[PDB]
Design an enzyme around this catalytic site. Sequence first.
Site, PDB file in Angstrom:
ATOM      1  N   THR A 104      -6.956   7.340   6.521  1.00  0.00           N
ATOM      2  CA  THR A 104      -7.302   7.568   5.139  1.00  0.00           C
ATOM      3  C   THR A 104      -7.299   6.291   4.326  1.00  0.00           C
ATOM      4  OG1 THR A 104      -5.019   8.088   4.632  1.00  0.00           O
ATOM      5  CG2 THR A 104      -6.498   9.943   5.203  1.00  0.00           C
ATOM      6  N   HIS A 143       0.846  -1.185   0.000  1.00  0.00           N
ATOM      7  CA  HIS A 143       0.000   0.000   0.000  1.00  0.00           C
ATOM      8  C   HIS A 143       0.886   1.242   0.000  1.00  0.00           C
ATOM      9  CE1 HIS A 143      -3.323  -2.671   0.645  1.00  0.00           C
ATOM     10  NE2 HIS A 143      -2.942  -3.012   1.864  1.00  0.00           N
ATOM     11  N   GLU A 180      -3.279  13.793   0.136  1.00  0.00           N
ATOM     12  CA  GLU A 180      -4.634  13.381   0.417  1.00  0.00           C
ATOM     13  C   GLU A 180      -5.475  14.622   0.745  1.00  0.00           C
ATOM     14  OE1 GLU A 180      -4.056   9.852   3.220  1.00  0.00           O
ATOM     15  OE2 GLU A 180      -4.695   9.131   1.241  1.00  0.00           O
TER      16      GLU A 180
HETATM   17  C1  LIG Z   1      -6.777  -1.624  13.877  1.00  0.00           C
HETATM   18  O1  LIG Z   1      -6.347  -0.673  12.871  1.00  0.00           O
HETATM   19  C2  LIG Z   1      -5.085  -0.659  12.534  1.00  0.00           C
HETATM   20  C3  LIG Z   1      -4.109  -1.516  13.107  1.00  0.00           C
HETATM   21  C4  LIG Z   1      -2.783  -1.417  12.695  1.00  0.00           C
HETATM   22  C5  LIG Z   1      -2.431  -0.480  11.727  1.00  0.00           C
HETATM   23  C6  LIG Z   1      -3.412   0.355  11.162  1.00  0.00           C
HETATM   24  N1  LIG Z   1      -2.992   1.264  10.270  1.00  0.00           N
HETATM   25  C7  LIG Z   1      -3.733   1.221   9.067  1.00  0.00           C
HETATM   26  C8  LIG Z   1      -3.910   2.248   8.154  1.00  0.00           C
HETATM   27  C9  LIG Z   1      -3.382   3.514   8.375  1.00  0.00           C
HETATM   28  C10 LIG Z   1      -3.592   4.602   7.564  1.00  0.00           C
HETATM   29  C11 LIG Z   1      -3.057   5.734   8.133  1.00  0.00           C
HETATM   30  S1  LIG Z   1      -3.137   7.304   7.459  1.00  0.00           S
HETATM   31  N2  LIG Z   1      -2.862   7.311   5.891  1.00  0.00           N
HETATM   32  O2  LIG Z   1      -4.449   7.706   7.689  1.00  0.00           O
HETATM   33  O3  LIG Z   1      -2.206   8.102   8.156  1.00  0.00           O
HETATM   34  S2  LIG Z   1      -2.289   5.432   9.625  1.00  0.00           S
HETATM   35  C12 LIG Z   1      -2.656   3.796   9.514  1.00  0.00           C
HETATM   36  S3  LIG Z   1      -2.238   2.534  10.587  1.00  0.00           S
HETATM   37  O4  LIG Z   1      -2.207   3.083  11.911  1.00  0.00           O
HETATM   38  O5  LIG Z   1      -0.916   2.237  10.219  1.00  0.00           O
HETATM   39  C13 LIG Z   1      -4.742   0.276  11.561  1.00  0.00           C
HETATM   40 ZN   LIG Z   2      -1.322   8.069   5.385  1.00  0.00          ZN
END
Ligand SMILES: COc1cccc(N2C=Cc3cc(S(N)(=O)=O)sc3S2(=O)=O)c1
Ligand SMILES: [Zn+2]
EC number: 4.2.1.1
Length: 257
Positions: free
Chosen positions: A195, A61, A103
Amino acid sequence: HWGYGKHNGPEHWHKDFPIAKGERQSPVDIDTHTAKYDPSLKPLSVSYDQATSLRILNNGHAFNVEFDDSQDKAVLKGGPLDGTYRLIQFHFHWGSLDGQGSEHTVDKKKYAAELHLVHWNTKYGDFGKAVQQPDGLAVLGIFLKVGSAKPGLQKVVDVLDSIKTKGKSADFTNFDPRGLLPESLDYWTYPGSLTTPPLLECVTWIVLKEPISVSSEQVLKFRKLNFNGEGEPEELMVDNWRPAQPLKNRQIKASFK
Ligand SMILES: COc1cccc(N2C=Cc3cc(S(N)(=O)=O)sc3S2(=O)=O)c1
Ligand SMILES: [Zn+2]
Ligand SMILES: [Hg+2]
């Protein structure tokens, strides 16, 4: 499952993650004329001098630099936050062209890329608990515009060759995240979400008004990453960003006027 393709991109997310159409989804367009200056907003406190990076990895991703968050090594405080938020990782979102990639937009303006330094509210014990709270996470968003090279970004740019495909990781210790910060800590802030799926609404977004610049060759290296795993047909990792979401019952507060 989810991705950024016509068949599994942002427009398909709601089917598996209904919160996609929730009340506080990110990113949002930052309208600077209707954003409200808030004098009761404290300055940001970014203490990243004891930060300990561990790995850099391609997760299909984006590429993420992970940090040791077992102790208050690199923390975020002040601003609209109450409590200490630990840096656990940072990642980028970028486009296939310089005119897209961020974004969040400012007055509908899109930047070449966007950096997200992810922090979780320590009052909750661990990251997993934090993602179950409306104030569980604080993400510092920084815009990247194409211009002169960003010195602190080169170390990341160099290692991308070793994590070209999904699943690859490499040791990336002793990286200083302070090299990615703009000169000014002025910011906009509003309540939002992740996001990308699971699209959880636990984020207090702190988007800095001042962007950092990176050379076209630096951001060029981003675009040679692969969404696919090794041995799979190649998919360039580009445009891993979500379109702006409706603000709804929310107001963006500015720390500046
Ligand atoms: C249970 O949810 C979980 C568990 C472990 C990791 C994540 N993650 C997924 C996506 C994501 C997208 C981010 S953004 N682009 O908004 O900054 S931050 C983030 S995450 O914290 O790494 C979610
Ligand atoms: Zn992000
Ligand atoms: Hg939440």
